[PDB]
Write a protein that binds this DNA or RNA. Structure first.
Length: 436
DNA sequence: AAAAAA
């Protein structure tokens, strides 16, 4: 049933629903034929999760590789995240015959870099086959779910949402899940509902899952934050149909601008959110918008994230990162994006002699674009100049604040800029030149 | 305007 292992090296696609067999059954089969298999997954919890199931399901303790915990068993099957895979330097010389790239539809920087690394090192590493598995191939469109009945919203309601309202009785009793785009609006919506006597709580990246009562009436207003260690299944799901993403704009003021904005959800988003209900029983899905943008596309800002991660985490030169990204963008059947490898590469190539301390800080802070942040900070300190602003993203320069004065040598815009700006800095001129 | 993995 699973893709046949070719005599020579080949890259195969695995389009199939139900996120289970593709990461358990498929690999279990290959191993039965005496093959060494590597299964990569974006999630750490998922990767650790497959370890426990494989044992009890196929009586074979697979190897587990994640940033937190690593476990070797010599077994023919190894489960690992893309992150951990990258940190391990990629494909080991002759370690696996088949490499499975699960959730290959994910457009996050780590997965794209990961898959691109596989597509470039697989064959040489000795692998005989690469599998790009996903339940939602590029260009997918949400399909009506059996145990789920979708219903639109209207002005009819006492709780304003995103252009509409939500009936009080619609969520009066039972367990419900409300999806909001912003983390602050989650606390707002939850505030009102809970204020109306309703038992509503907010959830997002940071708060522990223990906040949501495993039983009893409750309304959860959360973001797309993964509820690791929590049995989903909700009587209904109200979705705002909006996703928060980062977009890049070549505003030439003086160079580029990376900002996080909103945007209508795509098939994947819609599917995943609507999937939190209708598990084993009839569920409901209340939306604010009927349409949906086709899945399979990601912004150029993501490639920028790849070069940043290659620089900050995986000790990859800009050119090296390009090899792996070039392989990704040259492989059909995967998420597409405007080819800006050359431009992004040239940008990062000029970002030399970064302050190790600042880099360490931005990385440890778990901030976005830690490399670009730390580098801007480096230029600022090197010029005894203040950062673009004193927003939390520049906190690595706080101890130097007393001695920083004058215009910020702006290299690019990563958020709001409060301080005065100058564009005379050599690195800024270099970047301006790349824009051409 | 969020999340996630290094």
């Amino acid at each position: 049933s699973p893709p046949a292992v070719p005599q020579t090296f080949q890259v195969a696609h695995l389009h199939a629903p139900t996120g289970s067999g593709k990461s358990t059954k498929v690999p279990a089969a290959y191993a039965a034929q005496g093959y060494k298999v590597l299964v990569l997954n974006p999630s750490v919890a998922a990767t650790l999760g497959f370890g426990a199931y494989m044992s009890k399901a196929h009586g074979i303790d697979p190897n587990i590789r994640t940033g937190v915990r690593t476990i070797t068993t010599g077994a023919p099957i190894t489960y690992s995240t893309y992150g951990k895979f990258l940190a391990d330097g990629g494909c080991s010389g002759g370690a696996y015959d088949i490499i499975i790239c699960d959730e290959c539809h994910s457009t996050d920087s780590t997965t794209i870099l990961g898959i691109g690394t596989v597509l470039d090192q697989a064959e040489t590493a000795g692998a005989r086959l690469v599998v790009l598995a996903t339940a939602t191939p590029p260009g997918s469109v949400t399909v009506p779910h059996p145990n789920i009945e979708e219903v639109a919203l209207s002005s009819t309601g006492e709780i304003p949402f995103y252009g509409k309202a939500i009936p009080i009785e619609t969520i009066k009793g039972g367990r419900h899940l409300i999806f909001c785009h912003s983390k602050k609006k989650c606390d707002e919506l939850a505030a009102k509902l809970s204020g109306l006597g309703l038992n509503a709580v907010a959830y997002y990246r940071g708060l522990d899952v223990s906040v949501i009562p495993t039983s009893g009436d409750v309304i959860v207003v959360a973001t797309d934050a993964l509820m690791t260690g929590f049995t989903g299944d909700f009587d209904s799901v109200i979705d705002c149909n909006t996703c928060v993403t980062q977009t890049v704009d070549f505003s030439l003021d003086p160079t580029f601008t990376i900002e996080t904005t909103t945007v209508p959800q795509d098939a994947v988003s819609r599917s995943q959110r609507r999937g939190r209900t209708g598990r084993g029983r009839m569920g409901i899905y209340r939306f604010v918008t009927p349409g949906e943008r086709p899945s399979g596309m990601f912004d150029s800002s993501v490639l920028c994230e790849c070069y940043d991660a290659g620089c900050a985490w995986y000790e990859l030169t800009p050119a090296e990162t390009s090899v792996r990204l070039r392989a990704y963008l040259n492989t059909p059947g995967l998420p597409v994006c405007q080819d800006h490898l050359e431009f992004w590469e040239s940008v990062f190539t000029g970002l030399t002699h970064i302050d190790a301390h600042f880099l360490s800080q931005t990385k440890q802070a778990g901030d976005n674009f830690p490399y670009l942040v730390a580098y801007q900070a480096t230029v600022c300190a090197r010029a005894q100049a203040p950062p673009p602003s004193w927003d939390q993203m520049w906190k690595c320069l706080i101890r130097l604040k007393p001695t920083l004065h004058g215009p910020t040598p702006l290299l690019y815009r990563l958020g709001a800029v409060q301080n005065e700006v100058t564009t005379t800095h050599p690195i800024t001129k270099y970047i301006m030149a790349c824009m051409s």
